[PDB]
Nucleic acid binder design. Structure first.
Ligand SMILES: [Mg+2]
Ligand SMILES: [Mg+2]
Ligand SMILES: [Mg+2]
Ligand SMILES: [Mg+2]
Ligand SMILES: [Mg+2]
Ligand SMILES: [Mg+2]
Ligand SMILES: [Mg+2]
Ligand SMILES: [Mg+2]
Ligand SMILES: [Mg+2]
Ligand SMILES: [Mg+2]
Ligand SMILES: [Mg+2]
Ligand SMILES: [Mg+2]
Ligand SMILES: [Mg+2]
Ligand SMILES: [Mg+2]
Ligand SMILES: [Mg+2]
Ligand SMILES: [Mg+2]
Ligand SMILES: [Mg+2]
Ligand SMILES: [Mg+2]
Ligand SMILES: [Mg+2]
Ligand SMILES: [Mg+2]
Ligand SMILES: [Mg+2]
Ligand SMILES: [Mg+2]
Ligand SMILES: [Mg+2]
Ligand SMILES: [Mg+2]
Ligand SMILES: [Mg+2]
Ligand SMILES: [Mg+2]
Ligand SMILES: [Mg+2]
Ligand SMILES: [Mg+2]
Ligand SMILES: [Mg+2]
Ligand SMILES: [Mg+2]
Ligand SMILES: [Mg+2]
Ligand SMILES: [Mg+2]
Ligand SMILES: [Mg+2]
Ligand SMILES: [Mg+2]
Ligand SMILES: [Mg+2]
Ligand SMILES: [Mg+2]
Ligand SMILES: [Mg+2]
Ligand SMILES: [Mg+2]
Ligand SMILES: [Mg+2]
Ligand SMILES: [Mg+2]
Ligand SMILES: [Mg+2]
Ligand SMILES: [Mg+2]
Ligand SMILES: [Mg+2]
Ligand SMILES: [Mg+2]
Ligand SMILES: [Mg+2]
Ligand SMILES: [Mg+2]
Ligand SMILES: [Mg+2]
Ligand SMILES: [Mg+2]
Ligand SMILES: [Mg+2]
Ligand SMILES: [Mg+2]
Ligand SMILES: [Mg+2]
Ligand SMILES: [Mg+2]
Ligand SMILES: [Mg+2]
Ligand SMILES: [Mg+2]
Ligand SMILES: [Mg+2]
Ligand SMILES: [Mg+2]
Ligand SMILES: [Mg+2]
Ligand SMILES: [Mg+2]
Ligand SMILES: [Mg+2]
Ligand SMILES: [Mg+2]
Ligand SMILES: [Mg+2]
Ligand SMILES: [Mg+2]
Ligand SMILES: [Mg+2]
Ligand SMILES: [Mg+2]
Ligand SMILES: [Mg+2]
Ligand SMILES: [Mg+2]
Ligand SMILES: [Mg+2]
Ligand SMILES: [Mg+2]
Ligand SMILES: [Mg+2]
Ligand SMILES: [Mg+2]
Ligand SMILES: [Mg+2]
Ligand SMILES: [Mg+2]
Ligand SMILES: [Mg+2]
Ligand SMILES: [Mg+2]
Ligand SMILES: [Mg+2]
Ligand SMILES: [Mg+2]
Ligand SMILES: [Mg+2]
Ligand SMILES: [Mg+2]
Ligand SMILES: [Mg+2]
Ligand SMILES: [Mg+2]
Ligand SMILES: [Mg+2]
Ligand SMILES: [Mg+2]
Ligand SMILES: [Mg+2]
Ligand SMILES: [Mg+2]
Ligand SMILES: [Mg+2]
Ligand SMILES: [Mg+2]
Ligand SMILES: [Mg+2]
Ligand SMILES: [Mg+2]
Ligand SMILES: [Mg+2]
Ligand SMILES: [Mg+2]
Ligand SMILES: [Mg+2]
Ligand SMILES: [Mg+2]
Ligand SMILES: [Mg+2]
Ligand SMILES: [Mg+2]
Ligand SMILES: [Mg+2]
Ligand SMILES: [Mg+2]
Ligand SMILES: [Mg+2]
Ligand SMILES: [Mg+2]
Ligand SMILES: [Mg+2]
Ligand SMILES: [Mg+2]
Ligand SMILES: [Mg+2]
Ligand SMILES: [Mg+2]
Ligand SMILES: [Mg+2]
Ligand SMILES: [Mg+2]
Ligand SMILES: [Mg+2]
Ligand SMILES: [Mg+2]
Ligand SMILES: [Mg+2]
Ligand SMILES: [Mg+2]
Ligand SMILES: [Mg+2]
Ligand SMILES: [Mg+2]
Lengths: 46, 272
RNA sequence: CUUUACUAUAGUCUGGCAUUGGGAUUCGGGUUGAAACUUGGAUUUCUAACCUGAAAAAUCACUUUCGGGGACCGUGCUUGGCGGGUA
RNA sequence: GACAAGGGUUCCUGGGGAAGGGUCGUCCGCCCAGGGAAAGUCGGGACCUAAGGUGAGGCCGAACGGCGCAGCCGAUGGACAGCAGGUCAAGAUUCCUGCACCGAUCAUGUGGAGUGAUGGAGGGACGCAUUACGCUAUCCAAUGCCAAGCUAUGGCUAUGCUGGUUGGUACGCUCAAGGGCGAUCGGGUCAGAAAAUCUACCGGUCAUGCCUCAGACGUAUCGGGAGCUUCCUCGGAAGCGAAGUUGGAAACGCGACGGUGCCAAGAAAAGCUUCUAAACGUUGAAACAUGAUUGCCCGUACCGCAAACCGACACAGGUGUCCGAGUGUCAAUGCACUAAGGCGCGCGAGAGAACCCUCGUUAAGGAACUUUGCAAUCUCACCCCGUAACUUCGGAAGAAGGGGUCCCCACGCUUCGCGUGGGGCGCAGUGAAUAGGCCCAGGCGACUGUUUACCAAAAUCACAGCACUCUGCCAACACGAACAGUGGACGUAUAGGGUGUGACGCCUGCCCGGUGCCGGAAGGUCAAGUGGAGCGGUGCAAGCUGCGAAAUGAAGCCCCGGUGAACGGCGACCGCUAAGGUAGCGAAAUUCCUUGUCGGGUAAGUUCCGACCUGCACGAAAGGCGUAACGAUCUGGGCGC
RNA sequence: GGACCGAACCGGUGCCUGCUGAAACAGUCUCGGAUGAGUUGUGUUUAGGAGUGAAAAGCUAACCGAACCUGGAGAUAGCUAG
C-alpha cells in the first residue's frame, strides 16, 4: 500500500530549499514572512 | 519491387507488411556526419503539449544531410553506399568527394552504388547532379528543390515525390509540386535530377497497433469519445454523430486555413 | 454543461492612418489646345526603410562581399463583421 | 545472505525498572552513562557529459518578470591504481601481516636530442533475438587420499559410520579453446578554418602470416585448513596442524567488441593514440628503471522485504538491485522435505454447549437448489494411440476419446536412461506435493492490448485498415505578457494537422429545401472616413462657431450555383416539405400490444434457437449484412462430477 | 512471433472473510497478462478554467463536474437553531 511520503532527501532539499526559496520572489517572500512573527526555525534545518 | 508479406502464423502478421532491403549497405551511419542528437521528445516545448500525441517510440540518431550542395559545385563524387535513415522515409547516399570529404544526400530512384555524380551548374542532367533550374530541361522530373536561392531543399524530399519543370517564364521558372500545385522558383535555385526512392513507401501495410509505436506513439483520441468538458463533440447518451462539426477548438473540416499572404502572388493555381 | 437565450470578449477578417520611399502609364482635376508647379487614385516597376537566407564567425553582432522577398507582410491607432473558444 | 534508499546512535559494554512493551518482565529497538566508526587504490569530489537547470553579451514584456548561442551546473551513464588472509565486546578492499600497483616530485645512471596546445584527426561508440566452441565459479560421485573415534536392540567389526579434501602471489622452453590485425611508397588541393610527418580520398606495390591470453598444469612461496593440545577467572584464551585424488555436471559469469539472422535502425563528452600552430630548447629534451619522498575532502557503526524506511501502532499492507545450497520429480528460481542460517510471530491456562469461521468423510439420489451449477466437486503431470463441423489453410486442437506409469531379473541401444521379454507386490504405482472438466448453439467486439486508485473491466476506449478535409514551409495547427522563443520538424504532400469509421469479405442507395462549407464581375443594404449643398447661434463687422445630406466608402449578410465516408432527412392516418428506403436484416442489446403465431428442445419452457413478418420507433463508414480465430465478455442447452 | 504453458514480477476475474478491520480498500482460495502497446530504478519536465488522460469528468499528496493554503471576510443567509 504505497503511501504519499517517499522521503528521498535532496528532492526534499531541491524544492523547499533555502537555496530554492531564495531564487524566486514568491518564496523569498515566504522566507522573510517566516523570519517575522513566528520567530521560526525554518527550511533546511528541518 | 519486393515487400515481404508474412504467413498468418499469428493473429496479426497476415495483413502485416514490412519494407524491402538489401539495397541498403550493411554499414553503420559511421562517424560524425550524423552527430546525432535527436533526443526524441513529445510536443512539450515550454512545458505544454502543442501537437497532440507523439509520446514515445524507438531511439533514433539523426544523420546530417547536405541539402543545398552549392559549395561542392564542380567537384566529382562517387556513390559509396545506401543506408537506412529513420525520420526520413527516403534512402540516403554516402559517396565520397574527390577532395576526400564524405557527406549525405537523399537517394533518388534508381541510383546504383558506385555512380559518378557531379554537383554544380555545368553538370549533365544525370541522376543526382544538383544543378539550377535555368539549366534544367523542360518537363524533366527532379526533386529536393530549393524554395529560395540558398537555404536548403524544402520541396519534395519524401519518397516517390518529384517535381517536373514547367516552362520558365521570367528568371522565375514555373514548376509543379507533388501536391499538384504550380509555383514560381528562382532559376538560381538548385534541384536534384529524378524522383525519390524507397519505392512506394505508401503501401507497406504497417502491421498492427504498436508498429505505429515503433514510431511516434499517437493513440489519437477521437474527441467524440471525450466528455463535453474536454472536447466539443463530446457528450451524449450512447453513440451520437456530431450536431455541429467544428474541431477541436472550434474551426471545422473544409474551410481553408491559410492566411492571405505575400507568397500568394508567387503561387500558381492554389486549387489542389 | 449546453445552444439559432441576453451581453460582452480572447481570437480573427476588413476599411482608414502611421512605420512608408522613388519612377513610368493612365484617368479626376485645380493653381501660372499644350507647357507645367502638380494633388491623389489604379495597375506596373525599382530600391535606400523593413523582412529574410548562405559564407571561415551555431543565438547575436557586424565592414560585410553577397542571394531572395520588398511598400506587401509584420506592427501601433481606429472602422465594421464574425466569434459558446471564453465570461 | 549482501547492498542502494531512507532512518540517526537504534551498534557494543556496564548499569536501570517509572513510563513506553497489547499480560508479565530480573528483559528490550525503552532509560542513564561510557565506548565504537580509521582508505592514495572501494563510492562520491579535486575529471567528463544526458535530460533538465542555468546563462555575460543577445532577444522580448504595465511591473515582479519571460527567453536564449557559447560556457557552466547536473549520475541514473563514461573514465580510474590491490589482492590474500588475520582480528576489538563493538570497524575493515579503511587497521596489521605478507606480497602488489598508481600518480606526483626530486636525486642517480642510460639517452645526450626534441618536446608536443584552449586547434585538426583517429577512438571512446553503444540495438533486439538467437547461437557454436573453450573455461571457471560451483555442485555431484567413489573400496581416491587424511583425520578422529565406537561397535549400539537382531546384524555389521569395515569394503561400516563421520568430517575435511586448497586460496593468493611469483616464475616456468609446458597444455590450451577462444579472440583482432593488413603493411608500405606515391598523388591530388577543391576535404578536415591555414598547418600537419596525422585522418579522409584516389592510384601502386607483398590457406598462411602475426599479436593475444580466458583457463589448465608444474615448481616455489605466503595463507588457509578437519581437528589435536594445554590453560580456563564459568567458559573462552594461546599454541599446533593432516591431504589436497580420479570420474561427472555447469551458468544469466569469463574467453570477446565471437557467429548468424532481423527492422522499429539502436547518447554525448573527457581521459586516451597520433599531428601540427605558438612557444621554449637546438651541450643539461622525450623515453626507460632506480631508489627516495609524497598521497588531501566527504562517506564507512547499526537497521535495511523490516518491531529500526513509508503506513498515527513493536501495523497480515507497500519498498529498487545482487547472492540464494542439497535430494527427489523431462527441465526450473516450480512442488515436497531439508543444509548453512533464521525462527515458533510479547498474554496465558482450561473446557469440548448453541452459534460463527476454515477444513475432512459421507447412505440412496444427482441440479430436484437457485435469479444463475453462485460455491464446491470431477478433471489434472509426462508418454503413446487417436481426434469434428467450420477455416482467412496459420488454425480450431491439449478438439472430445483410449491406453500406459511401481519394484526385481535377463537382454539390446545413442546407457542421468530407454526399448523389449520374464517375474513380484498393494485396494491403489506423476502411490505424498505442485499442474485443464468438456462439449453444442447463439448476442457484442475481429484480434494482443486500455479504462472508473476506494461498488462498474465491458458490448467503453485504443487498434491496423478505410474516408472526408486542412496545410507550399516564418505550413496548416497548437503554448505564449511578447513583431521574443519553442513545439509541429532539424519534418517538406508517399509529409503534417483535424474529423469520423474501425481486421477481413461482399458492399455503402434516395433527398441538398433549410444550416455549414468551397466557388459565385451584374444588383439590394451597409461603418469609420473623403465630401460638406444648406439650416441656426453671436458680434456693428473681419470673423468665430452648433449641428448637418447628395455622392463616394471594405469585408460581410440578402440574392445565384455546387457540395452529403458535411449537420442532417427517408410515418406527428395517408395531407405536403427536398424527398419519401437500393441491397441486406427484422418479435431483433431496436417490439408498445407480447408469454405475437407456428416449429425445435423439456415430462412440463414468459428464456434460448429457427422461421415468418403486421419494423409502435432496422438500414448502409453514429456504417449495412457476414465472418475463421480470440474473450476472467453476455445468453440458452447437453455430458461429466 | 502485440504465439502458447507457467514462476519472478505487473494486474485485479469470482466467491468468501473482513466492516470499532491485521489494513481509511486488504487476506485465503480462484483468475488475467508473463519478449511487449512489457515491468521499474534514478534524475527531470508539465498545475488550478490550468495540467495530464488508449477517455471514467478519470488523476493532479487517503473526499477533484474544478486541488490546497492565506487573504477580501464577521462574504451573503427572505432559511434552521439559540
Ligand atoms: Mg534552530
Ligand atoms: Mg545542510
Ligand atoms: Mg517538520
Ligand atoms: Mg512468403
Ligand atoms: Mg489539453
Ligand atoms: Mg499507412
Ligand atoms: Mg486513426
Ligand atoms: Mg464517455
Ligand atoms: Mg465546449
Ligand atoms: Mg456532441
Ligand atoms: Mg442513441
Ligand atoms: Mg487546440
Ligand atoms: Mg479584438
Ligand atoms: Mg470593434
Ligand atoms: Mg455560459
Ligand atoms: Mg452569442
Ligand atoms: Mg534478507
Ligand atoms: Mg544513509
Ligand atoms: Mg551514519
Ligand atoms: Mg542492543
Ligand atoms: Mg550485552
Ligand atoms: Mg516495568
Ligand atoms: Mg525514572
Ligand atoms: Mg507492562
Ligand atoms: Mg539490553
Ligand atoms: Mg594499504
Ligand atoms: Mg562540464
Ligand atoms: Mg546541452
Ligand atoms: Mg531561462
Ligand atoms: Mg539550453
Ligand atoms: Mg553512479
Ligand atoms: Mg578503480
Ligand atoms: Mg571514482
Ligand atoms: Mg572475538
Ligand atoms: Mg559487524
Ligand atoms: Mg577483510
Ligand atoms: Mg641529453
Ligand atoms: Mg612528433
Ligand atoms: Mg556454453
Ligand atoms: Mg559407500
Ligand atoms: Mg567420506
Ligand atoms: Mg595438483
Ligand atoms: Mg540478473
Ligand atoms: Mg554476440
Ligand atoms: Mg568540454
Ligand atoms: Mg613552427
Ligand atoms: Mg558494515
Ligand atoms: Mg503491534
Ligand atoms: Mg508484535
Ligand atoms: Mg508489518
Ligand atoms: Mg516489489
Ligand atoms: Mg541458483
Ligand atoms: Mg532448489
Ligand atoms: Mg532438481
Ligand atoms: Mg518453493
Ligand atoms: Mg531477520
Ligand atoms: Mg511464546
Ligand atoms: Mg471449510
Ligand atoms: Mg455413492
Ligand atoms: Mg451421474
Ligand atoms: Mg425451484
Ligand atoms: Mg430448477
Ligand atoms: Mg464455478
Ligand atoms: Mg486446481
Ligand atoms: Mg488440420
Ligand atoms: Mg470454441
Ligand atoms: Mg493384486
Ligand atoms: Mg497395473
Ligand atoms: Mg501425485
Ligand atoms: Mg492435498
Ligand atoms: Mg442470426
Ligand atoms: Mg435475444
Ligand atoms: Mg474487445
Ligand atoms: Mg493470450
Ligand atoms: Mg473500481
Ligand atoms: Mg472491479
Ligand atoms: Mg519568430
Ligand atoms: Mg519551430
Ligand atoms: Mg466507434
Ligand atoms: Mg439544383
Ligand atoms: Mg418468441
Ligand atoms: Mg416485453
Ligand atoms: Mg413438445
Ligand atoms: Mg434446465
Ligand atoms: Mg413453443
Ligand atoms: Mg430461469
Ligand atoms: Mg433474464
Ligand atoms: Mg429468433
Ligand atoms: Mg449513405
Ligand atoms: Mg451515417
Ligand atoms: Mg443508427
Ligand atoms: Mg459498429
Ligand atoms: Mg450483425
Ligand atoms: Mg483480453
Ligand atoms: Mg455474468
Ligand atoms: Mg451456461
Ligand atoms: Mg446420457
Ligand atoms: Mg506473448
Ligand atoms: Mg490457442
Ligand atoms: Mg489499473
Ligand atoms: Mg498483488
Ligand atoms: Mg488462460
Ligand atoms: Mg475551460
Ligand atoms: Mg497525508
Ligand atoms: Mg485523491
Ligand atoms: Mg470545491
Ligand atoms: Mg458568517
Ligand atoms: Mg466584503
Ligand atoms: Mg446572495
Ligand atoms: Mg450579512
Amino acid at each position: 500500500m504505497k503511501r504519499t511520503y517517499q522521503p528521498n532527501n535532496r528532492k526534499r532539499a531541491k524544492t523547499h530549499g533555502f537555496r530554492a526559496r531564495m531564487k524566486t520572489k514568491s518564496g523569498r517572500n515566504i522566507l522573510a514572512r517566516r523570519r517575522a512573527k513566528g520567530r521560526h526555525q525554518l527550511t533546511v534545518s528541518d | 519491387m519486393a515487400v515481404k508479406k508474412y504467413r498468418p502464423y499469428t493473429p496479426s502478421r497476415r495483413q502485416m507488411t514490412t519494407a524491402d532491403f538489401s539495397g541498403l549497405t550493411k554499414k553503420r551511419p559511421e562517424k560524425a556526419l550524423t552527430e546525432a542528437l535527436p533526443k526524441t521528445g513529445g510536443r512539450n516545448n515550454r512545458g505544454r503539449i502543442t501537437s497532440r500525441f507523439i509520446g514515445g517510440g524507438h531511439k533514433r540518431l539523426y544523420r546530417i544531410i547536405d541539402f543545398k550542395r552549392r559549395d561542392k559545385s564542380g567537384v566529382n563524387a562517387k556513390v559509396a553506399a545506401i543506408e537506412y535513415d529513420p525520420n526520413r522515409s527516403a534512402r540516403i547516399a554516402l559517396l565520397h568527394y574527390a577532395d576526400g570529404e564524405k557527406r549525405y544526400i537523399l537517394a533518388p530512384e534508381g541510383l546504383t552504388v558506385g555512380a559518378t555524380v557531379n554537383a554544380g551548374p555545368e553538370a549533365e542532367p544525370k541522376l543526382g547532379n544538383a544543378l539550377p533550374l535555368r539549366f534544367v530541361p523542360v518537363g524533366a522530373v527532379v526533386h529536393a528543390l530549393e524554395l529560395v536561392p540558398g537555404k536548403g531543399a524544402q520541396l519534395a524530399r519524401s519518397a516517390g515525390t518529384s517535381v517536373q519543370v514547367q516552362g520558365k517564364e521570367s528568371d522565375y521558372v514555373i514548376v509543379r509540386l507533388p501536391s499538384g500545385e504550380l509555383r514560381r522558383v528562382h532559376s538560381e535555385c538548385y534541384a536534384t535530377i529524378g524522383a525519390v526512392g524507397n519505392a512506394e513507401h505508401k503501401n507497406i501495410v504497417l502491421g498492427k497497433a504498436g508498429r505505429s509505436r515503433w514510431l511516434g506513439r499517437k493513440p489519437h483520441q477521437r474527441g467524440s469519445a471525450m466528455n463535453p468538458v474536454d472536447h466539443p463533440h463530446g457528450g451524449g447518451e450512447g453513440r451520437t454523430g456530431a450536431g455541429r462539426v467544428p474541431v477541436t477548438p472550434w474551426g471545422k473540416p473544409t474551410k481553408g486555413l491559410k492566411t492571405r499572404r505575400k507568397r500568394k502572388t508567387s503561387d500558381r493555381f492554389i486549387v489542389t
